[PDB]
Amino acid sequence: EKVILDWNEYIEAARSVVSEGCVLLENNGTLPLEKGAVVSIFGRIQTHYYKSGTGSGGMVNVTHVVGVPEGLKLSEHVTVNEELENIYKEWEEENPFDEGTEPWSQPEMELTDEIVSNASAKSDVAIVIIGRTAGEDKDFSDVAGAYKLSETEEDMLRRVRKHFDKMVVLLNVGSLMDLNVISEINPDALMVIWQGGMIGGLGTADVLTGKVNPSGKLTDTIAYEINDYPSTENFGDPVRDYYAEDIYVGYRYFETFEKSKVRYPFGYGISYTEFEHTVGEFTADINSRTFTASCTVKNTGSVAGKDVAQFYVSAPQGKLGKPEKVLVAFKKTGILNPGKEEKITVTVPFDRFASFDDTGVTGAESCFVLEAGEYTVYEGKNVRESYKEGSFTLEENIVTEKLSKALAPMESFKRMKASENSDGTLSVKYEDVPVSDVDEKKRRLDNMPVEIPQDFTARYSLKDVLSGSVDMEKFIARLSDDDLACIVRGEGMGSSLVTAGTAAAFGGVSEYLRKMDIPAVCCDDGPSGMRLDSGATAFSMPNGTMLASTFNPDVIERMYGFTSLEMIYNKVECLLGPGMNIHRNPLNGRNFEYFSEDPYLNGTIASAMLKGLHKYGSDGVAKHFCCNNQELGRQACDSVVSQRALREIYLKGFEIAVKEGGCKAFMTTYAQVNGMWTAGNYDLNTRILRDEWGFKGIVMTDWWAQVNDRGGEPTKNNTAAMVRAQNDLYMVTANAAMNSANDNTLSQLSEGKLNRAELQRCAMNICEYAMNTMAMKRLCRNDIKVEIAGR
Numbered sequence: 001e002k003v004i005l006d007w008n009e010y011i012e013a014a015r016s017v018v019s020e021g022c023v024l025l026e027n028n029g030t031l032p033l034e035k036g037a038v039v040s041i042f043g044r045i046q047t048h049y050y051k052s053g054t055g056s057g058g059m060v061n062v063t064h065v066v067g068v069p070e071g072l073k074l075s076e077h078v079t080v081n082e083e084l085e086n087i088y089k090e091w092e093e094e095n096p097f098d099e100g101t102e103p104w105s106q107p108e109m110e111l112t113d114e115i116v117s118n119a120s121a122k123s124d125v126a127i128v129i130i131g132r133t134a135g136e137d138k139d140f141s142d143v144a145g146a147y148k149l150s151e152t153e154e155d156m157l158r159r160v161r162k163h164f165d166k167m168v169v170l171l172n173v174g175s176l177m178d179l180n181v182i183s184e185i186n187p188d189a190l191m192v193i194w195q196g197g198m199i200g201g202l203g204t205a206d207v208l209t210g211k212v213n214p215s216g217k218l219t220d221t222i223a224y225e226i227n228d229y230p231s232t233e234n235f236g237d238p239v240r241d242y243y244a245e246d247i248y249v250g251y252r253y254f255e256t257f258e259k260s261k262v263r264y265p266f267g268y269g270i271s272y273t274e275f276e277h278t279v280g281e282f283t284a285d286i287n288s289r290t291f292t293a294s295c296t297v298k299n300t301g302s303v304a305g306k307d308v309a310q311f312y313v314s315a316p317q318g319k320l321g322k323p324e325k326v327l328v329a330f331k332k333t334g335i336l337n338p339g340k341e342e343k344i345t346v347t348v349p350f351d352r353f354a355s356f357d358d359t360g361v362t363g364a365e366s367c368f369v370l371e372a373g374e375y376t377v378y379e380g381k382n383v384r385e386s387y388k389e390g391s392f393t394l395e396e397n398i399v400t401e402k403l404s405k406a407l408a409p410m411e412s413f414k415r416m417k418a419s420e421n422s423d424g425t426l427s428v429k430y431e432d433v434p435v436s437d438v439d440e441k442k443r444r445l446d447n448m449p450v451e452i453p454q455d456f457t458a459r460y461s462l463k464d465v466l467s468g469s470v471d472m473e474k475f476i477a478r479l480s481d482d483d484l485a486c487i488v489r490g491e492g493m494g495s496s497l498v499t500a501g502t503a504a505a506f507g508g509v510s511e512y513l514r515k516m517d518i519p520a521v522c523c524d525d526g527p528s529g530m531r532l533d534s535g536a537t538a539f540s541m542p543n544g545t546m547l548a549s550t551f552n553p554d555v556i557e558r559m560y561g562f563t564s565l566e567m568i569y570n571k572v573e574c575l576l577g578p579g580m581n582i583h584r585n586p587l588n589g590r591n592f593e594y595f596s597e598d599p600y601l602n603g604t605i606a607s608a609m610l611k612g613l614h615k616y617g618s619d620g621v622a623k624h625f626c627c628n629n630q631e632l633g634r635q636a637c638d639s640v641v642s643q644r645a646l647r648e649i650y651l652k653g654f655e656i657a658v659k660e661g662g663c664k665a666f667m668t669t670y671a672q673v674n675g676m677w678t679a680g681n682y683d684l685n686t687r688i689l690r691d692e693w694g695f696k697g698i699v700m701t702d703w704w705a706q707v708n709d710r711g712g713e714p715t716k717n718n719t720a721a722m723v724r725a726q727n728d729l730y731m732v733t734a735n736a737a738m739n740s741a742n743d744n745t746l747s748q749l750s751e752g753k754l755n756r757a758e759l760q761r762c763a764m765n766i767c768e769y770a771m772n773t774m775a776m777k778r779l780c781r782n783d784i785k786v787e788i789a790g791r
């Protein structure tokens with residue numbers, strides 16, 4: 001089989017994401033830009049369009065990046081003031097783009113009254129571009145040049161505001177920055193254009209010129225101040241952060257307790273037209289544990305466009321306490337012409353708005369439950385402007401799922417609690433989070449897998465398992481203790497077993513393993529496109545937050561469908577994404593390659609990406625599992641967090657990726673969750689992921705990540721602790737066959753501290769995964785051959 005990867009269709013797919021992911025925040029009709037307008041573009045970052053964040057998910061090599069000025073010229077709908085372009089060009093020869101550990105921003109060119117006045121005299125409209133990047137190992141700081149405007153950027157904005165009566169501000173940013181000073185200066189239009197990959201300027205020009213009507217929505221709540229965010233109190237400590245806000249993350253906090261601290265609510269975004277959402281039929285089916293809600297969205301303005309219907313549930317406070325509203329469903333309309341409408345119907349399972357009882361107060365400890373009382377469903381344009389769709393009342397609690405006490409905090413701390421005041425409004429009070437009473441050593445011992453007796457005369461290939469000819473158990477008996485100790489080691493970076501410049505090879509990492517037809521499976525960064533450290537080019541796609549802002553799983557899936565083929569072309573089997581850690585705080589540096597403060601949106605967008613990658617047999621690796629919500633101190637840092645917050649917020653997106661997304665590969669973190677490293681955490685990697693969610697796949701460490709037993713010293717070679725957790729793969733070693741990290745797999749096995757059954761389980765996970773990859777198909781000679789056309 002031979003498949004064409006059409007590069008022009010790939011471009012168009014990515015461009016569609018850009019034009020659906022831009023978020024228009026304010027506009028007085030200055031957008032869209034009028035046909036034949038002359039635009040003056042301000043901001044030195046105009047010449048170096050941020051196509052991505054920095055670090056592992058920002059090192060995609062490309063031949064060309066289309067920035068905003070070039071996008072606008074290629075549109076043929078406007079022209080750009082060339083004199084001002086040359087002023088920026090000539091100044092930049094003297095003040096070159098700093099490539100660094102790259103800085104968050106570039107120094108702005110100071111502007112004079114003469115430049116700005118002369119620009120306005122020869123143009124119809126000013127566009128001011130403020131650029132920010134961020135990423136791995138540095139957190140975004142609440143200072144000028146990072147989250148705040150620089151003094152010279154502010155001066156630029158004030159001068160342009162004075163001399164132009166039409167002003168447009170664009171935020172070419174990985175994550176949201178302070179809007180207070182920008183809002184005070186009061187431009188005529190404000191749009192967040194994120195970082196759109198290599199064709200970002202094309203999709204951005206589409207929305208600016210009106211060829212596409214913007215339809216992007218915020219995936220985070222924008223508060224007035226950094227200190228309004230509930231997590232700011234407990235964010236940015238390199239050693240330990242207590243997740244005291246608990247389930248009250250983002251709009252779960254603000255809509256419940258602090259509506260007046262919101263500038264822009266979750267799900268907010270506007271269009272060049274206006275829409276009217278009319279609530280429709282509502283039914284509930286308690287026996288099936290679903291409800292069905294309908295509404296109609298009508299374009300009531302004068303230009304075609306899409307809108308998003310967003311559905312929320314208000315649960316009764318009960319004994320647990322609840323956020324006012326939780327997102328349970330959304331649907332983006334087709335393009336609606338003026339005066340036309342679309343009926344949207346959603347069926348919502350009760351598990352979308354259940355609560356995890358981690359205290360026992362409901363009578364069902366360690367369960368997801370719907371407490372007795374009234375459930376009100378809302379629909380609207382955003383969480384704030386969502387209106388009653390229907391209600392139903394439960395006279396008794398319904399247990400949606402029985403789970404276990406898992407990943408519980410090892411120390412007490414106080415968490416936020418919804419308290420219903422005398423009047424009936426909700427205030428924040430605090431309560432003690434109960435401590436874990438789980439016997440961890442016992443749990444491991446009681447659920448120990450059975451050893452498979454070894455048999456080295458067996459000549460079964462991995463091909464014989466794939467065809468159904470033999471059981472995986474029969475095959476795995478062939479692996480020696482050497483083979484077992486070797487197969488749990490990933491080799492990289494730049495292993496010679498796979499495409500050069502990628503992150504890792506795993507599976508067939510010795511002559512012996514490859515002789516059994518276990519192929520070398522290739523892993524590579526990242527969510528926004530293949531990072532090839534050989535210098536080879538690949539498609540640079542929009543950042544994760546831009547993807548999520550589309551509220552459009554279909555457009556995301558379509559784009560990653562092309563990535564699926566591109567990966568096969570490069571013989572990359574595992575793309576190291578989606579990044580899908582919750583936006584707990586706006587200052588986390590890696591927010592650009594994650595999706596949302598909301599777990600449902602997070603899991604739904606992740607799943608769309610995975611479905612895309614699955615189209616032609618490629619795959620993603622969900623990361624970082626879990627609670628890597630802060631870059632500072634991420635090697636040592638301990639996230640202290642309640643079971644409920646884990647179950648409803650931080651794990652929830654990952655759960656969705658497994659059950660809806662078909663996720664079969666996970667990456668753990670550099671850090672600790674509840675007092676041990678995640679790579680050695682049994683509750684995370686076995687109890688929750690496998691035994692409760694039913695995940696069938698592989699777990700790998702983060703690259704050169706530390707591992708420990710609870711209480712013990714962290715090291716980059718405690719592979720025994722890793723295998724005891726069912727974290728299947730240590731990424732990475734320079735030479736896996738030679739044990740170049742000097743790991744303790746065999747010595748622990750020798751001492752009876754690691755059981756061979758545990759190694760065998762990991763080996764089976766690895767082989768089961770490996771045999772369904774395109775690398776196996778290359779051995780079997782039935783892989784897809786890809787040819788790139790259109791270039």
Ligand SMILES: OC[C@H]1O[C@@H](O)[C@H](O)[C@@H](O)[C@@H]1O
Pocket residue numbers: 056503525576623702703
């Ligand atoms: O590049 C391989 C890995 O490196 C680590 O530093 C990052 O945390 C991961 O996100 C990445 O996938």
